Design a protein around this ligand. Sequence first.
Ligand SMILES: O=c1cc(O)n([C@@H]2O[C@H](COP(=O)(O)O)[C@@H](O)[C@H]2O)c(=O)[nH]1
Ligand SMILES: O=c1cc(O)n([C@@H]2O[C@H](COP(=O)(O)O)[C@@H](O)[C@H]2O)c(=O)[nH]1
Lengths: 218, 219
Amino acid sequence: MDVMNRLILAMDLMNRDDALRVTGEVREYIDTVKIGYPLVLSEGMDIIAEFRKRFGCRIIADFKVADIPETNEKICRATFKAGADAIIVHGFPGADSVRACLNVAEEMGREVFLLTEMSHPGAEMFIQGAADEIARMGVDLGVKNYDGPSTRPERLSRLREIIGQDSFLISPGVGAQGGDPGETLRFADAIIVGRSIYLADNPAAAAAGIIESIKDLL
Amino acid sequence: VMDVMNRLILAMDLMNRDDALRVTGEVREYIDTVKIGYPLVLSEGMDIIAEFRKRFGCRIIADFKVADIPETNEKICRATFKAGADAIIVHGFPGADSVRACLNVAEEMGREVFLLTEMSHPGAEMFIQGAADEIARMGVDLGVKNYDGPSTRPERLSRLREIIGQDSFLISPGVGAQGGDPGETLRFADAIIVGRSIYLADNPAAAAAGIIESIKDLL
Ligand SMILES: O=c1cc(O)n([C@@H]2O[C@H](COP(=O)(O)O)[C@@H](O)[C@H]2O)c(=O)[nH]1
Ligand SMILES: O=c1cc(O)n([C@@H]2O[C@H](COP(=O)(O)O)[C@@H](O)[C@H]2O)c(=O)[nH]1
């Protein structure tokens, strides 16, 4: 997956007008947008096609899929029908739940990203202790795309170690949550940035600035 | 606690508005509480909640298995309650701050949170099972009053009931299609959740009536 400027926009505004305007303002800097439930539950799944029509960006559906296999399959089908290129799935519910998502993705020509450790403080309670095992489970299942935390670079490095250099790794928690763009890109293929861009006075200048700070990383 | 008619909640996971409305309408005399999840919402929009309230006046539990960071959890809960959901189902495994975020929105908006502590499928044994007692205890410490736990593992469901106490409200899926028994589950749960056994039946009303007949002495 070739992500322009190694930068994925987390578009978590909850108003169609604002989301479209802000994404338009930063379009020259990105070609990959992560759309999650804040926007989808506010404006509907049709917003995905709207983004493809307006921006011709790739779309990652950040739906944190975390149900039983039967329901996961249905969620993946609905999501890919809406035009998402990829979907983010939790590993904590186990291998069968992940495999259900991999099956649908294969059937519809899409990608699954496995979320192995999360970036927020609460992740330390239960997820962190399972995270290495979840990553190994991903490897066992043939997962090639992973998602891990900018806010703990040593944990992100470990994730990279487990999955190897051939796997693709994206990482949220940059900016607002305290993660550093350049340090994160030591390990991740691409950084995910939400509030630092979409809540900025000037989103375009915010994106431009981030990219300036990592310019020697590409 | 919510007064669930016949201790039976419909898991409406059909993905077509026409079929979902037909089936729900057919069992309305037996069930006043409907669990709507992402299969239906991602297919038909959040306005499906509005349509169910307009058509049936049923209580709506939004089964969104909320499992994000606190800031995103807050946004999801706000959007969900804005749409008319009475309650939302939240994962505990992302930790206390993520759960608290949902509780805070529910409190502000006058709605309810159900904490999912453990799951019914085989994969739940890998990571969730080992954390479940602590996730449940965390819920109690946070003041969670409503819980969601698996019918397919009676011993686990019993332990969850112990942890949360008799005053807490507990709903339980995995009845029917996944092998859980209605009566046995209601030893511990306040209400059972049933999806496929009802919504894939040739006569969903007869399927619901049959389940209720089997637990008649427990009503
Ligand atoms: O561990 C994780 C996994 C996520 O998907 N996310 C998501 O990544 C984005 C982070 O956005 P922000 O840059 O505003 O903090 C949000 O959409 C959040 O839901 C995260 O923050 N931490
Ligand atoms: O542990 C759990 C938690 C759930 O929410 N569920 C949900 O409960 C319902 C079970 O439906 P069914 O009766 O068709 O097996 C589905 O909506 C599923 O997503 C579950 O099966 N197991």
